[PDB]
Amino acid sequence: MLRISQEALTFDDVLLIPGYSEVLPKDVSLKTRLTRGIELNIPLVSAAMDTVTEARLAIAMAQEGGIGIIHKNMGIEQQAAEVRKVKKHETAIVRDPVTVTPSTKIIELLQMAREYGFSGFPVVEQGELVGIVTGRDLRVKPNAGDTVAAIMTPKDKLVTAREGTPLEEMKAKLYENRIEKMLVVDENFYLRGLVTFRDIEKAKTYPLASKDEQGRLRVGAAVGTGADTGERVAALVAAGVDVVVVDTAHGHSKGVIERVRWVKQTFPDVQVIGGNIATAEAAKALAEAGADAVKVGIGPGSICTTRIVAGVGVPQISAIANVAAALEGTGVPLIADGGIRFSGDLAKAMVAGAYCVMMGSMFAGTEEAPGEPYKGALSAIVHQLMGGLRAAMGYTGSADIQQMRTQPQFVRITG
Amino acid sequence: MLRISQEALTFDDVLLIPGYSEVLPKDVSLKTRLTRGIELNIPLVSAAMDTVTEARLAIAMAQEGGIGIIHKNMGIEQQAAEVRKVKKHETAIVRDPVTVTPSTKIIELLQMAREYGFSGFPVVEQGELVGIVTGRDLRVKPNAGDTVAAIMTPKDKLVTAREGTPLEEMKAKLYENRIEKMLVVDENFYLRGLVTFRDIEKAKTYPLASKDEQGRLRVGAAVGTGADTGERVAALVAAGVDVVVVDTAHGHSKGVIERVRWVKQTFPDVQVIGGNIATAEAAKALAEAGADAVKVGIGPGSICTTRIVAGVGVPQISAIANVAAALEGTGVPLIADGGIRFSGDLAKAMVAGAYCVMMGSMFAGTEEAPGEPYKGALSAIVHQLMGGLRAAMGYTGSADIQQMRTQPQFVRITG
Amino acid sequence: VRKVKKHETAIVRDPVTVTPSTKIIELLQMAREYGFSGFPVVEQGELVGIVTGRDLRVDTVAAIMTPKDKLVTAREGTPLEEMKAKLYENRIEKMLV
Numbered sequence: 062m063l064r065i066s067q068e069a070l071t072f073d074d075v076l077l078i079p080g081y082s083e084v085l086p087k088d089v090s091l092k093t094r095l096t097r098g099i100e101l102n103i104p105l106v107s108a109a110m111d112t113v114t115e116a117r118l119a120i121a122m123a124q125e126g127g128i129g130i131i132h133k134n135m136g137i138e139q140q141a142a143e144v145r146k147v148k149k150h151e152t153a154i155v156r157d158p159v160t161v162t163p164s165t166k167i168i169e170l171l172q173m174a175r176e177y178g179f180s181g182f183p184v185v186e187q188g189e190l191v192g193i194v195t196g197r198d199l200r201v202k203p204n205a206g207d208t209v210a211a212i213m214t215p216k217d218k219l220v221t222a223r224e225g226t227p228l229e230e231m232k233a234k235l236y237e238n239r240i241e242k243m244l245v246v247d248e249n250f251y252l253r254g255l256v257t258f259r260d261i262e263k264a265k266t267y268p269l270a271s272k273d274e275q276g277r278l279r280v281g282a283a284v285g286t287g288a289d290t291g292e293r294v295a296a297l298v299a300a301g302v303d304v305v306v307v308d309t310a311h312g313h314s315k316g317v318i319e320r321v322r323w324v325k326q327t328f329p330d331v332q333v334i335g336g337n338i339a340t341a342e343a344a345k346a347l348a349e350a351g352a353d354a355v356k357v358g359i360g361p362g363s364i365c366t367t368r369i370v371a372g373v374g375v376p377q378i379s380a381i382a383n384v385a386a387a388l389e390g391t392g393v394p395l396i397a398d399g400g401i402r403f404s405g406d407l408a409k410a411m412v413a414g415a416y417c418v419m420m421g422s423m424f425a426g427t428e429e430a431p432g433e434p435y436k437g438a439l440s441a442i443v444h445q446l447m448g449g450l451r452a453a454m455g456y457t458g459s460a461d462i463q464q465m466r467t468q469p470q471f472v473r474i475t476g
Numbered sequence: 477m478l479r480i481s482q483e484a485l486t487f488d489d490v491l492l493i494p495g496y497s498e499v500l501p502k503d504v505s506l507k508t509r510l511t512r513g514i515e516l517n518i519p520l521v522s523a524a525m526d527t528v529t530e531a532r533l534a535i536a537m538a539q540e541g542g543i544g545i546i547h548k549n550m551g552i553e554q555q556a557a558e559v560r561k562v563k564k565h566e567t568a569i570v571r572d573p574v575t576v577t578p579s580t581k582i583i584e585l586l587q588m589a590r591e592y593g594f595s596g597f598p599v600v601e602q603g604e605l606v607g608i609v610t611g612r613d614l615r616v617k618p619n620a621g622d623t624v625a626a627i628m629t630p631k632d633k634l635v636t637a638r639e640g641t642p643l644e645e646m647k648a649k650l651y652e653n654r655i656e657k658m659l660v661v662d663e664n665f666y667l668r669g670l671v672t673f674r675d676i677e678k679a680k681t682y683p684l685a686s687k688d689e690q691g692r693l694r695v696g697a698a699v700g701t702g703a704d705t706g707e708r709v710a711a712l713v714a715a716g717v718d719v720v721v722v723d724t725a726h727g728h729s730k731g732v733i734e735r736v737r738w739v740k741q742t743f744p745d746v747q748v749i750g751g752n753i754a755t756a757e758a759a760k761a762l763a764e765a766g767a768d769a770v771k772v773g774i775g776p777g778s779i780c781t782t783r784i785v786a787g788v789g790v791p792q793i794s795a796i797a798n799v800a801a802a803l804e805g806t807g808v809p810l811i812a813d814g815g816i817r818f819s820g821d822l823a824k825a826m827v828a829g830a831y832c833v834m835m836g837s838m839f840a841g842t843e844e845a846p847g848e849p850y851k852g853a854l855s856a857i858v859h860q861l862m863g864g865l866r867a868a869m870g871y872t873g874s875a876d877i878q879q880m881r882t883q884p885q886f887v888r889i890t891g
Numbered sequence: 892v893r894k895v896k897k898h899e900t901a902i903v904r905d906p907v908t909v910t911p912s913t914k915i916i917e918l919l920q921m922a923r924e925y926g927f928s929g930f931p932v933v934e935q936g937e938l939v940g941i942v943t944g945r946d947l948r949v950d951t952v953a954a955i956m957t958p959k960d961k962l963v964t965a966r967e968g969t970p971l972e973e974m975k976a977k978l979y980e981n982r983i984e985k986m987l988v
């Protein structure tokens with residue numbers, strides 16, 4: 062008459078059993094679903110933390126084939142402006158470069174300059190492009206009580222490209238005119254972007270980039286429950302957010318359920334994820350409320366505060382599986398959120414039933430993450446992660462993710 | 477509806493239960509099979525790693541009663557030349573000693589000399605033996621613009637032995653002529669070997685030495701899958717290799733199966749091992765393909781990258797047993813490859829069902845291993861290993877290996 | 892010693908040169924050892940152009956060099972402040988004396 066439901070397993074309790082395999086790791090397909098209406102080419106999502114996902118990494122994740130969820134620890138208008146950044150981003154275009162103006166004194170220019178760590182500035186007048194100044198233009202004082210009009214390259218010169226021009230054509234003109242900056246303009250010669258030679262010499266055609274119907278990069282955003290949530294969700298949906306995540310510690314509650322329903326009935330053109338949960342019953346509740354995806358993870362970390370401060374949690378491998386089984390015929394995907402420290406874990410989560418996995422601290426050290434163990438680019442981490450998934454998929458003989466989630470088997474281990 | 481096949485046990489989960497015992501450790505028989513057509517006097521095989529098995533250790537292992545598998549991390553002709561070394565090796569004979577020539581200047585001799593760390597050189601002419609020079613010959617310049625012809629011991633002198641002469645007769649003549657070098661010659665007086673007094677004063681009659689039908693030391697070699705494999709296997713079989721090991725991370729695959737079959741149908745006079753595997757189904761696949769032995773081991777190490785980077789593996793004790801059971805009536809042996817850190821483990825593997833065990837890092841520090849914790853001679857390690865096996869065999873009352881593999885029992889333990 | 896004695900402070904006497912002719916693969920290869928890019932292009936004494944870093948971001952130097960009918964030269968001893976003046980107005984870094 063002690064009330065134990067079951068024995069629950071985490072990642073370190075199980076291993077994947079190798080199977081007959083005809084497809085090589087490099088040839089398996091990693092494409093999956095984030096929500097019933099959103100598809101990722103890789104099963105990766107970055108977590109909604111101020112140390113992890115803002116616009117900068119959100120972009121990176123979208124380009125890599127996954128998605129980022131902007132964190133809410135910031136003003137409403139700030140969070141929506143991050144969503145704007147990601148939704149409006151083109152590869153290497155600064156679409157809002159720092160500018161100057163014919164009448165800005167050269168004293169101000171040197172000052173700016175210094176403050177920013179670069180020297181190239183388009184000269185504008187109420188949006189109209191009228192000239193450009195750079196480092197070369199500044200190598201002599203004509204003698205300084207004078208302005209950018211005096212040293213800038215005048216309008217009649219100026220190499221320009223229209224907005225939406227391929228980088229190649231764009232690269233070609235920079236070299237042929239032996240210059241380093243390309244000014245993007247529109248049909249009225251208003252300045253729409255800056256594109257540098259240095260920025261073109263990097264970063265691909267991301268053929269996996271997760272894009273919306275309009276060819277813009279996908280992004281999500283977190284929201285809590287209570288009072289500003291409705292106002293918050295509204296600004297985020299106005300910003301063009303693809304998916305709204307109702308992100309909480311206890312997803313199996315009146316307040317979370319009600320809010321997921323409220324979102325899905327008020328903003329019918331967004332996708333809604335509901336979370337965190339860890340049981341079958343919780344899963345069915347969010348599905349009924351109309352959740353487009355369900356997020357799985359309560360006390361999934363052995364030292365995490367949920368376990369230790371509250372004595373609450375469910376080992377992730379059994380949580381995921383219990384939720385997977387619950388959502389069977391629904392078409393509602395599940396995301397595995399927490400407790401993954403190695404790429405082996407990511408494979409295990411997938412075979413347990415996840416459609417893709419959310420990660421926090423993996424990405425937290427990265428070059429893209431906010432501010433300032435600095436792990437360098439997100440490229441290497443994401444590549445290693447998928448590297449291991451593919452290896453796992455090779456061993457088990459799973460050609461794609463549907464198969465990986467449904468067919469391989471585990472051995473239970475001890476120590 | 478979480479998909480667990482079973483609970484799997486590793487070495488630290490079990491212990492051997494002592495039984496009625498009439499034969500002492502020193503009196504049990506350790507002879508076993510490596511492949512259906514190759515017999516070892518001890519159940520030891522050294523692993524195919526650039527840090528472990530090249531010709532030098534391959535020899536040592538053969539002489540000790542086991543076998544070595546030359547690694548593939550080298551050019552095709554290089555790997556085959558290692559196989560040649562082992563297959564052509566006689567105890568203490570340098571069969572390709574460094575030589576000189578009547579006309580090599582004494583400047584060159586002193587130089588060589590230094591470079592090599594020894595001073596004794598047979599003097600030859602297109603294979604014909606014509607004289608010898610050593611340290612004593614070099615203790616005065618007659619005055620150096622002159623050659624080895626001038627200081628060497630002439631042909632008419634020269635103690636020689638024909639090739640294939642016992643070391644005793646050979647030792648006897650060295651002492652009686654009070655000299656340190658024996659020159660081996662053939663029926664035309666062509667130089668076939670050098671045999672030193674220092675080299676005779678060491679190393680036995682290895683009565684356990686694993687030899688082929690022609691009395692040459694046995695050796696194996698690893699090969700992968702893909703493109704040069706066919707060419708590689710061909711040069712290795714031309715080199716006289718006893719056994720070809722198709723050594724891969726995932727043995728239960730189209731590519732490995734197909735290649736094992738290809739080898740066994742193209743080179744019918746070699747033995748073929750197929751690997752790594754960890755399930756019963758995998759075992760049956762390689763047996764069907766015609767494997768002469770099967771190698772067992774996937775993620776057998778608690779920290780190993782397979783487990784951690786890919787989340788894949790099967791604890792070795794259950795892998796071995798599951799494979800043993802599968803190969804029952806076939807006559808196809810199984811080799812246990814990975815996860816052994818103490819000699820107790822080696823006994824456990826044997827009782828679990830292995831015919832012999834492959835080891836890597838055990839031998840990796842050794843004097844024979846490639847280059848440069850230096851563990852000294854392979855003798856001591858191999859002796860300690862078998863020491864513990866014999867003790868285990870004493871406790872369980874197993875007079876030989878067939879019995880050890882089939883009769884004793886385990887207790888399951890906890891911590 | 893000659894190396895020092897041939898140093899002005901900066902007019903550089905005896906500069907490293909190249910030819911249209913010399914392969915583009917080899918340029919790039921200099922380039923990298925010498926330090927510095929930028930080489931007055933010469934045939935057999937006569938100045939026929941100039942090749943700097945900007946010309947290289949793209950078989951002979953003939954295709955990518957900056958040609959004679961476009962070179963900014965200054966005759967010797969033009970003072971240095973006059974020479975800087977001209978360098979500024981052409982928005983270039985190297986003056987050929």
Ligand SMILES: Nc1ncnc2c1ncn2[C@@H]1O[C@H](COP(=O)(O)OP(=O)(O)OP(=O)(O)O)[C@@H](O)[C@H]1O
Binds near residue numbers: 257
């Ligand atoms: N006005 C600006 N506003 C926003 N971003 C800028 C601006 N100017 C430069 N950047 C960013 O900084 C990068 C480097 O600027 P910088 O002026 O150093 O380029 P550059 O003159 O081409 O340098 P280099 O001569 O080494 O190629 C650009 O590629 C761009 O990403």
Ligand SMILES: Nc1ncnc2c1ncn2[C@@H]1O[C@H](COP(=O)(O)OP(=O)(O)OP(=O)(O)O)[C@@H](O)[C@H]1O
Binds near residue numbers: 196198219239242
């Ligand atoms: N798109 C453009 N059209 C016309 N002129 C330009 C353009 N971009 C830059 N310039 C002009 O070309 C000259 C060189 O500018 P650029 O920015 O390429 O080099 P820089 O970064 O100033 O030089 P450096 O790399 O040596 O510091 C300057 O006079 C600048 O005003």
Ligand SMILES: Nc1ncnc2c1ncn2[C@@H]1O[C@H](COP(=O)(O)OP(=O)(O)OP(=O)(O)O)[C@@H](O)[C@H]1O
Binds near residue numbers: 570575595597
């Ligand atoms: N020409 C050679 N080619 C290959 N190996 C050699 C050659 N000469 C010597 N060795 C190896 O080096 C060992 C020692 O050579 P060294 O010349 O020191 O012998 P040594 O003169 O008999 O020494 P000591 O006088 O101490 O007995 C030999 O036993 C042999 O294994």
Ligand SMILES: Nc1ncnc2c1ncn2[C@@H]1O[C@H](COP(=O)(O)OP(=O)(O)OP(=O)(O)O)[C@@H](O)[C@H]1O
Binds near residue numbers: 611
């Ligand atoms: N097989 C042989 N037949 C005839 N003479 C030999 C033979 N081997 C060596 N000698 C000669 O015997 C002499 C002594 O040679 P040996 O190699 O035994 O001693 P060493 O190593 O030169 O002397 P030490 O050990 O003091 O350095 C030399 O003149 C050498 O040329």
Ligand SMILES: Nc1ncnc2c1ncn2[C@@H]1O[C@H](COP(=O)(O)OP(=O)(O)OP(=O)(O)O)[C@@H](O)[C@H]1O
Binds near residue numbers: 905908926927931
């Ligand atoms: N072809 C050459 N032969 C000999 N000396 C040279 C040559 N080119 C440059 N130098 C000298 O070595 C230095 C190399 O600098 P570099 O050629 O990079 O100048 P730069 O391109 O004008 O530099 P920056 O772009 O940073 O202003 C120059 O200051 C010059 O004194």
Ligand SMILES: Nc1ncnc2c1ncn2[C@@H]1O[C@H](COP(=O)(O)OP(=O)(O)OP(=O)(O)O)[C@@H](O)[C@H]1O
Binds near residue numbers: 942984985
């Ligand atoms: N004396 C000159 N006359 C005519 N053109 C020149 C002269 N010197 C350089 N150029 C040309 O001007 C352009 C840039 O040359 P410059 O040496 O000023 O740039 P750079 O050394 O490549 O500077 P960075 O690498 O810092 O951009 C090239 O097209 C080059 O051929």
Ligand SMILES: [Mn+2]
Binds near residue numbers: 196241
């Ligand atoms: Mn610049």
Ligand SMILES: [Mn+2]
Binds near residue numbers: 241
């Ligand atoms: Mn530059």
Ligand SMILES: [Mn+2]
Binds near residue numbers: 656
């Ligand atoms: Mn000696």
Ligand SMILES: [Mn+2]
Binds near residue numbers: 656
């Ligand atoms: Mn001696």
Ligand SMILES: [Mn+2]
Binds near residue numbers: 944984
């Ligand atoms: Mn320069």
Ligand SMILES: [Mn+2]
Binds near residue numbers: 984
């Ligand atoms: Mn410059």
